[PDB]
Each structure stands twice: as C-alpha cells, then as structure tokens.
Amino acid sequence: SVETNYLPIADPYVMFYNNKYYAYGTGGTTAGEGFACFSSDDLKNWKREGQALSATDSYGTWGFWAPEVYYVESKKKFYLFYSAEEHICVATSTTPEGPFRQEVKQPIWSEKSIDTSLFIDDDGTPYLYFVRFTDGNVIWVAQMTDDLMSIKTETLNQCIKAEVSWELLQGKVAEGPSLLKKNGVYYLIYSANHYENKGYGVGYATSDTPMGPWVKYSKNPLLQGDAATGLVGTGHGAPFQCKDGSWKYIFHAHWSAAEIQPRTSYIKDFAISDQGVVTISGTVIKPRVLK
C-alpha cells in the first residue's frame, strides 16, 4: 500500500551502498526535527527506514537542512554532513539508516553556513563545499582535517556567486554544491536563485583543481523546470551512480505551480560526456513511498 505518491523531501541526496539506494533530505521527518532515511531497490518505490538523525543527538533545534551521507572507506563508518540553525555539522553512524549522532553537539566552525558537500580526491585530501553569506549565498571550499570534523580555515577559497541572468531571477544565491571529478577535471554542480522562485535551477562550473579557479558552463542552466511534467522550482540536487553503471540526478521541485510547500523529490538522467559536458535529461522518475 501507498504512504505517499511523492518522495517528501527537499535538498535530496542519494547514497548507493551495498546494492541499495538511500535517500536523505530536508523535511519529511516522522519523529521530530532532524533527517529521515528512505531506501529503495529500483528508485521508483521507496520505503522509510526511520529517523537517521534526531535533534537531541545534534547541535541545534531548528533548521535541519541539506543532509549528505557518505561511507568513508578510510574510517569504515558513515558520515552525515548537514546544516542546523544555519551552521554546518557532522555526525556519524555505523549503519546507513542511523542513528547518526554527534559525541559533542557543536558545528564544524562558528560562522553561519549551510549546504555541506564533501569530496575526497584521488590524493586522499578531503574538501568540504558549503555556502557562506559573503555576497549573497556564495559557495566556498576548504580542506578538511584528517578526522573530517574541522575545516582548515587557511585553505578557504571562493568558488561560485550568483552573476549571470538565469542566476539572478530572485535574490543573490548560489548554493547546494555537488562535486564530481572525471578525466582530470573537477565539476562543481550548483543551484541558483532563492528556492521559492519557480526559476530555481541547476548549473555547473569546471576547474583543473578542487579549489578553483572556476569557469561556468556557457549553456547553464542544466535544469530550470522540467517541460514534460511541468515541475518548477527544480534544484538542490545530487548526482549518483546506479546498479547498472549509469548516472542519475535527484532533485526537488515545488509541490505544484500554485504552491511551493511541501517540496518533493524527483530523478532524471545524468552524464558527463567524453568532451567534458554535463547533461541532466530524460523522462522524470516520479518516486513514491510504500509501507
């Protein structure tokens, strides 16, 4: 039977671990503030796994946004990177579903920041992408310490700010970073505009280093509303590999053309060509939750 005909989260992230998809996003919780965990075998039908993170096990009581979860081979443990009260935080778990907890309930650093996304390079060096409120919402990067608990502030670098027309429909916002490396090029995939705008959209930038400098793709945006479904407010997503070796891009959209809330998530195809061009395309998978 059907719980809901949607995947009821915003700012979605998918981890493919041990032949199983695991989704985490903003909202859709059933046991208080924090993050839920959804799992799936096929990307269409999802089941709830429980409350991945409870507010009592973390810094903060409000604003649990934009979670990403990674199995770190180096540490043989799961790491949940997230925002809480407009600060960036990290919790750990021995399993994909949780409970993710902080031993000490504090953020990574003191400055307000959101939209954490981790990248560990071929070198073994960890990088954290996140938003600082320096000139609108701006995507920054810094190298992390070995324990993935702190950033090295001396490595702070500015990545992307809202500059071109499609990125300045509402407010001054570049956010929801995602990093992928392919054939020596680092691709920073991000969202621009206030999420409430129907023109929330996804674009990318490239660089020969993980911390820039960055050149934006000339044909951005990659995704700014899906034509076939009429989904609008499309953004804050994540790329991920599938069982068969192809890629997909999970993202949210407004509830409908009339109402923003509650945002829900959808899946399209994703790829980086041999000539280094990124595409988000294909018929939208409209996920649902079963019990």
Which residues contribute to the annotated binding site for Ca(2+)?
68, 236
Q: How far is the CB of 275 from Ca ion (least distance, A)?
A: 27
Q: Which residue stretch of 26-34, 44-52, 63-71, 273-281 sits at the interface with Ca ion (rule: CB under 5 A)? A: 63-71
Nearer of residues 3 and 120 to Ca ion, judged by Cβ: 120
**Is 111 tagged catalytic?**
no
- Active-site annotation holder among 49, 97, 167, 175: 175
Contact 26, 66 (CB under 8 A): yes
Give the residues across from 41 on adjacent strands: none
Residue nearest to Ca ion (CB): 66
Number of shown-chain residues binding Ca ion (CB under 5 A): 1
According to CB under 5 A, which residues from 189 to 248 bind Ca ion? none
Q: What does the per-residue mask of binding to Ca ion show for 15-54, with x meaning CB under 5 A?
A: ----------------------------------------
Determine the number of helices (DSSP H) and then strands (DSSP E) in the chain. Answer: 0, 21
Backbone torsions φ then ψ of 216, nearest 5 degrees: -75, 140
CA dihedral 61, 63, 68, 73 (to 10 degrees): -30
- Active-site annotation holder among 11, 97, 115, 226: 11
Q: Which residues are annotated as a binding site?
A: 68, 236
**Is 175 tagged catalytic?**
yes
Output the DSSP codes for 120-145.
E-TTS-EEEEEEE-SSSBEEEEEEBP
Q: How far is the CB of 26 from Ca ion (least distance, A)?
A: 9
Q: How far is the CB of 35 from Ca ion (least distance, A)?
A: 12
CA-closest candidate to residue 58, choices 37, 36, 80 = 80
| Cα–Cα separations (whole angstroms), residue 147 to 82, 84, 91 | 16, 20, 12
Q: How far is the CB of 81 from Ca ion (least distance, A)?
A: 9
Q: Which residue stretch of 65-73, 130-138, 149-157, 253-261 sits at the interface with Ca ion (rule: CB under 5 A)? A: 65-73
Nearer of residues 46 and 81 to Ca ion, judged by Cβ: 81
212-216: list long-range contacts, CB under 8 Å, 24+ apart.
212/141, 212/157, 212/158, 212/159, 214/159, 214/160, 214/188, 216/160, 216/163, 216/164
Which residues have a catalytic role annotated?
Answer: 11, 175
Binding site for Ca ion (CB under 5 A): 66
